[PDB]
Design a protein around this ligand. Sequence first.
Ligand SMILES: O=C1CCc2cc(N3CC[C@](O)(C(=O)NCc4cc(F)cc(Cl)c4)C3=O)ccc2N1
Ligand SMILES: [Mn+2]
Ligand SMILES: [Mn+2]
Length: 365
Amino acid sequence: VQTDPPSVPICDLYPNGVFPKGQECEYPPTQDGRTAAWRTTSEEKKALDQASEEIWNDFREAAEAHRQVRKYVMSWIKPGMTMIEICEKLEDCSRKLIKENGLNAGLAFPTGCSLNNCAAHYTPNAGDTTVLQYDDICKIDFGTHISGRIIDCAFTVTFNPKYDTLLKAVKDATNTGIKCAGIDVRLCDVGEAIQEVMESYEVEIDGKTYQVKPIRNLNGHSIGQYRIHAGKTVPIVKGGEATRMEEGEVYAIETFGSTGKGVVHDDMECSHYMKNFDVGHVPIRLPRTKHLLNVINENFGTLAFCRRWLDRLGESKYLMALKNLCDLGIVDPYPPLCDIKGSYTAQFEHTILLRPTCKEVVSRG
Ligand SMILES: O=C1CCc2cc(N3CC[C@](O)(C(=O)NCc4cc(F)cc(Cl)c4)C3=O)ccc2N1
Ligand SMILES: [Mn+2]
Ligand SMILES: [Mn+2]
């Protein structure tokens, strides 16, 4: 049985090594109208699904850890806490439930806790005194993995009911994206459907009215092994690419709603970094730079990391070494992504498996 607060690894809760499936859906019908039900009973589709069973089992173990962490977070996240306090309490729980073991199991990327106008990629660095406020809109976005099978799942936290319709708009747009997704579906069609649903909402916040805008330069994405962004884009506005989703792919279906411009730009101090997946072996003689790259290669590989995690590993005076890795193109910085000052942004996200037999919303219980 899981403790209160959670501390027992998901691995210990399932002695047989079989982790719970997420929500399973039949794929959407074709434009002509023929159903995709045939996939469930097809012997060919079953064998193929069975061929990838260990992979789905890893995503499910990571998803069960993600669900237990987020239910724990919802129970205590309150204004007055520092953003550092929130991230450390969440990560401590995630490390325990995932049974962190180097590159074999762990945290897939830093805990985003972006506030208000900032939509993504904010996590505090050491010394950040930011405190969560009653009127804040906080996007908790964190990831877990087993053998690099990543669960990318996020939700928005508020305390003031004035944002309730804004959150409902974004939740409905995310559920629309999940519903529209499937093998052979055009990525632009998903984007147009998401936008249609999000833009049907009007909200009133402190006497000002807004039509909920999707953040046009943010999007959902394909997921690869140890690769958070695998190359395919799931837009959240019309005008996108008519490229299609394929069998066996994994996607993060995420949407962002804004009362601002519906466009984000890099802002604030950078906390998130990640090795460029396409960069091969680069010999480094510069000793501090060489050491930091070895620390990154050992602890994170191609998974995203943050400055707090380098501090936790006992690294110090590494900022110039980190800038060098960025200048060399080995590491890429991912600074906070913000809409205009005074705007409010919300996000909801789930991970889906485009299995040969069905569509599994693996991060949804
Ligand atoms: O064109 C773009 C550029 C910005 C962008 C951002 C995103 N977001 C926003 C939050 C997100 O869900 C997440 O959890 N990110 C963790 C993460 C940490 C890193 F250090 C590096 C990377 Cl790649 C990802 C995600 O994927 C999604 C699409 C786009 N499209
Ligand atoms: Mn995310
Ligand atoms: Mn994502």
